[PDB]
Amino acid sequence: MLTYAQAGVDEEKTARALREIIRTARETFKLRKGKVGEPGDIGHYAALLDFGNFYLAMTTDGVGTKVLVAEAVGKFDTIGIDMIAMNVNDLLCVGAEPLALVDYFAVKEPNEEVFKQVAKGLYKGAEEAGVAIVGGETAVMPDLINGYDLAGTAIGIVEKGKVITGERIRPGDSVIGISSSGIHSAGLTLARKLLIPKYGLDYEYEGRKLWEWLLEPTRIYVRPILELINSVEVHGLAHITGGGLLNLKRLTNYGFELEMPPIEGIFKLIHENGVPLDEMFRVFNMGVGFIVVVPQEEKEEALEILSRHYKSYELGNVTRELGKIKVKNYGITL
Amino acid sequence: MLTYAQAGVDEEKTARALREIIRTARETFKLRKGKVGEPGDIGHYAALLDFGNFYLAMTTDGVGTKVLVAEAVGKFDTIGIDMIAMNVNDLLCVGAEPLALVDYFAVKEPNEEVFKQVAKGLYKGAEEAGVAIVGGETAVMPDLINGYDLAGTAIGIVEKGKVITGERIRPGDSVIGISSSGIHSAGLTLARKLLIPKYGLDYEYEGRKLWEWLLEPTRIYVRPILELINSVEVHGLAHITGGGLLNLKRLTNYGFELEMPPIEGIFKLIHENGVPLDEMFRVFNMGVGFIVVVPQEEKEEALEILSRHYKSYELGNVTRELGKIKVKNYGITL
Ligand SMILES: Nc1ncnc2c1ncn2[C@@H]1O[C@H](COP(=O)(O)O)[C@@H](O)[C@H]1O
Ligand SMILES: Nc1ncnc2c1ncn2[C@@H]1O[C@H](COP(=O)(O)O)[C@@H](O)[C@H]1O
Ligand SMILES: O=CNCC(=O)N[C@@H]1O[C@H](COP(=O)(O)O)[C@@H](O)[C@H]1O
Ligand SMILES: O=CNCC(=O)N[C@@H]1O[C@H](COP(=O)(O)O)[C@@H](O)[C@H]1O
């Protein structure tokens, strides 16, 4: 087909349905007014709860339908990495250090093989993120779940005065992208429906099977970002998840002028199957898993720090074209 | 369908499948050794995380297949109460005061009317529990979810020295039960599969339709328990969820000698349809939604405090004899 909506995930409809839940949530903030745990507003990558000298950051994230690929090939060995990565990467975007995670595992059956595989990736992700897995919930629910749905909730800590929300972003700031490991965990419904029936899961593309491209575990950005924020002045941090580059608009009203990396790997296969390029930058990470915004004079030091850990790119600059994201080398405006 | 396992939920097989996940989680504890967020052990109602002067308690709970009844009859405005109740009631069982919650909503479709109803119950539960809903996650996943699955994660706070785990439970202690509002959110898979085909959700039993029996929202115990633990010495706290009375074995290895309330309402219908009483006490709450263990000299004041909130019962005593839960007035030993 063409779009994420036609694949079954209508982001516009989802936002419409969610307005009532978000309004209700905001009404509950007053229940902790002036007390420990008093929250900030909803809409950012994590909630910030006032504990006096510090904020606790709290976020919740699932893997999505990536688990349907894992099931077909009997490899849940890295789905736990995906779940941990999505949660801890979101914590970083308020400037918090990730501490602990609980997982929610909703399954059609208590399959011992699936669970042993899930456990392997949970450890690898936890070790790379520096977090303890401290508890969880397992729900065997075959009438409600057609596979093995893995989600979780993570908490982190950020000192008062060191929160990074994006309000410090100014025009002229440099925009830097850290490469993704691949598709990560966003847009799998479109990728699965577009490619699997046409090509088959065993289709071989640049020496890897389609399932390998679809299952590649999400990259964890904790070490480079925690190093970065303790060395250079950071104005904004954005984990590229659902919404793609639109996630930058959660940080600032200022505009962005970007040059994005070449379209490669699975993203090229998807593009060559008719998804419009503007939709692609709103759905897939397109090679950039994480974006940082720093003062222009810190650009080279930031790149030196990030490049120790992962391939990183100077993407562009913040502008006064309020509310616009110009992908200059593709002629796209979001 | 005369046991929970025959209805599709085999707790033995779930525990077996979870072994590698629990083992891996414990191997991650060392990642926070001596740092902020260092955890206690897994196994209890909540995780305890060391923040210096206090512990942060964290738990995650879903509603279960109760949501399939809500969808069948079109009544979603109380499952938000169930979700909040499950989470905050578990936080109470380490002695913590609930502070904040995030919700995970995995849905077949973004239906605006469903979301509007869910939002009503979310507010009602949050106000009664005294918590803010500070964020969440919404996943539209029709290939994976056959309904509207609602879960959440809650955090609470407990001062060092005031944690209530059950280790202070001693033989001779008094065991007090607080009535449930009904079936709560445990065992719905058995109740759905056993009752709905034969009777239909419109069947009237003892003055209420079957859907009313199955959808009655889970009771919230925050106000009575917080008053209790600030008034008398409390040795153990147990929210009666999956496993029924077996949850007491998580607090202590000492035995229990109990008299349980008469079988009424939905529990009587289930029993009359062939589920034996011994299975029923390990699946359903059987009229008791929360159990407290206090030294005998606190028993009269504890009953007075609890009875001002909900119907409460002296159930029995902790025994020097180990491991056994004797329900004396039904001739059942668990
Ligand atoms: N079901 C939900 N309940 C409460 N808040 C939500 C829910 N889904 C998303 N949010 C919030 O909406 C914002 C955008 O979420 P997302 O689209 O997942 O990045 C974040 O602040 C979330 O915490
Ligand atoms: N999927 C999971 N991951 C980690 N811990 C879990 C999981 N499921 C259950 N637990 C833990 O096992 C204990 C019993 O949980 P429950 O059977 O839900 O009462 C609690 O301490 C939970 O935190
Ligand atoms: O305890 C916390 N949340 C509730 C919970 O864990 N529910 C889980 O969902 C399955 C079905 O429950 P049912 O639909 O039969 O009631 C079952 O595995 C329960 O353990
Ligand atoms: O961001 C946190 N977790 C990821 C996430 O939000 N996943 C959600 O699941 C749906 C499909 O995802 P897909 O299977 O197409 O990737 C979609 O509604 C996403 O928002």
Biggest interchain interface, per-side counts: A-B, 83 and 83 residues
**Overall 3D form of chain A:** globular
Separation of the first and last Cα atoms of chain A = 21 Å
Query: Which ligands accompany this protein?
Result: adenosine monophosphate, N-(N-formylglycyl)-5-O-phosphono-beta-D-ribofuranosylamine
Give the amount of beta strand of chain A, in percent.
Answer: 25-35%
For this entry, what is the oligomeric state of its chains? homodimer
> Nearest-angstrom radius of gyration of chain A?
20 Å
SS elements, strand count of chain A = 15
CATH topology of the largest domain in chain A: Phosphoribosyl-aminoimidazole Synthetase, Chain A, domain 2
Largest sheet of chain A, described in full?
7 strands, mixed
CATH class of the largest domain in chain A: Alpha Beta
- What percent of the residues of chain A sit in helical stretches (DSSP H or I)? 25-40%
Q: How do the helices and strands follow one another from N- to C-terminus of chain A?
A: HHEEEHHEHEEEHEEHHEEHHEHEEE
Report strand order across the widest sheet of chain A: 10-12-7-13-11-14-15
State the CATH superfamily name of the largest domain in chain A.
PurM-like C-terminal domain
- CATH architecture field of the largest domain in chain A: Alpha-Beta Complex
Number of helices of chain A: 11
Can you give me a brief rundown of this structure?
2 copies of one chain form a homodimer. Chain A has 334 residues and is of the alpha+beta class.
Task: Write a structural description.
2 copies of one chain form a homodimer. The first copy, chain A, has helices spanning 4-7, 11-28, 66-72, 79-92, 112-129, 188-199, 210-215, 222-229, 265-271, 277-283, 299-307; strands spanning 38-39, 47-50, 54-62, 97-107, 132-140, 148-159, 174-179, 204-205, 208-209, 236-239, 255-258, 288-294, 312-319, 325-327, 332-333. With 334 residues, chain A is α+β, with helices and mostly antiparallel strands. Chain A has a 7-stranded mixed beta sheet with strand order 10-12-7-13-11-14-15. Chain A has a 6-stranded mixed beta sheet with strand order 1-2-3-6-4-5. Chain A has a two-stranded antiparallel ribbon with strand order 8-9. In chain A, strand 1 and strand 2 (47-50) form a beta hairpin. In chain A, helix 4 packs parallel to helix 5 (112-129). The longest helix of chain A has 18 residues, at 11-28. Chains A and B meet through helix 2, strand 1, strand 3, strand 4 and helix 5 of A and helix 1, strand 1, strand 3, strand 4 and helix 4 of B. Chains A, B: GO terms for molecular function: ATP binding; phosphoribosylamine-glycine ligase activity; phosphoribosylformylglycinamidine cyclo-ligase activity.
